[PDB]
């Protein structure tokens, strides 16, 4: 086509989706990770995660307002990945890298799994 | 903070939101523009438009499944702007620029209004 493109548009959209998440606006699901609860938008979760994409395209699960994750999932690892989904920024640290990588593998977030593998390999 | 950032994350999220829109997945509103109907995600519309942001933060309108736009709004202009919201690409042409600019002013999409003004000024 002969379209023009606004470079900062995708980043501006994601910034506003994060602002709606912070103010709890039009969030339509609560993700339960052991004792912890995280409110989010189903569309953003599907757009970022192979696991959520599979869950919310399922004819019965698409209508659930609560999703319970596997008890082995660490709430902090999930929180870090949820923040990444809404911001593009990953808070990866020596003390959380193992939990973040295991959570990213479970959530099917291949780019996160890739950088965790590289950061671990460098420390070996 | 000490976060790392994935450069293509925002663009990848927007690409997936557009794929969900094309397959009509988790769309929660129909925008009526005279005889034409457009299905979309309320969160994406709010993230892109000052008008939709105001409508869907309103305690009564947030629950509507149908929104009717002003009869002066051109369906093609709306279609072009909806495509822009989901892709960052604006199909701006001599034959549609006046309708696109008027629709962007109504929808409160200031960056689109800005480029339409500049393209018009250059042709004068």
């Amino acid at each position: 086509d002969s379209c023009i493109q606004f470079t900062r548009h995708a980043s501006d959209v994601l910034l506003n989706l994060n602002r709606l998440r912070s103010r709890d606006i039009l969030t339509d699901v609560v993700i339960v990770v052991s004792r912890e609860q995280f409110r989010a938008h189903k569309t953003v979760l599907m757009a970022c995660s192979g696991l959520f994409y599979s869950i919310f395209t399922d004819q019965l699960k698409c209508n659930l307002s609560v999703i319970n994750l596997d008890p082995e999932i660490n709430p902090e690892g999930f929180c870090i990945l949820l923040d990444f989904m809404y911001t593009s920024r990953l808070n990866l640290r020596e003390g959380n890298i193992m939990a973040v990588m295991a959570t990213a593998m479970y959530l099917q977030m291949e780019h996160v799994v890739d950088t965790c593998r590289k950061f671990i390999k460098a420390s070996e | 903070d000490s976060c790392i950032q994935f450069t293509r994350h925002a663009s990848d999220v927007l690409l997936n939101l557009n794929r969900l829109r094309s397959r009509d997945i988790l769309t929660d509103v129909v925008i009526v523009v005279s005889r034409e109907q457009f299905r979309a995600h309320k969160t994406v519309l709010m993230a892109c438009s000052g008008l939709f942001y105001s409508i869907f933060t309103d305690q009564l309108k947030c629950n509507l499944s149908v929104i009717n736009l002003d009869p002066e709004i051109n369906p093609e202009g709306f279609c072009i702007l909806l495509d822009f919201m989901y892709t960052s690409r604006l199909n701006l042409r001599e034959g549609n620029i006046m309708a696109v600019m008027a629709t962007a002013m109504y929808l409160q999409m200031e960056h689109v209004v800005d480029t339409c003004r500049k393209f018009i000024k250059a042709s004068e």
Partner: peptide
């Protein structure tokens, strides 16, 4: 704005 750019030419993509």
């Amino acid at each position: 704005w750019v030419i993509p």
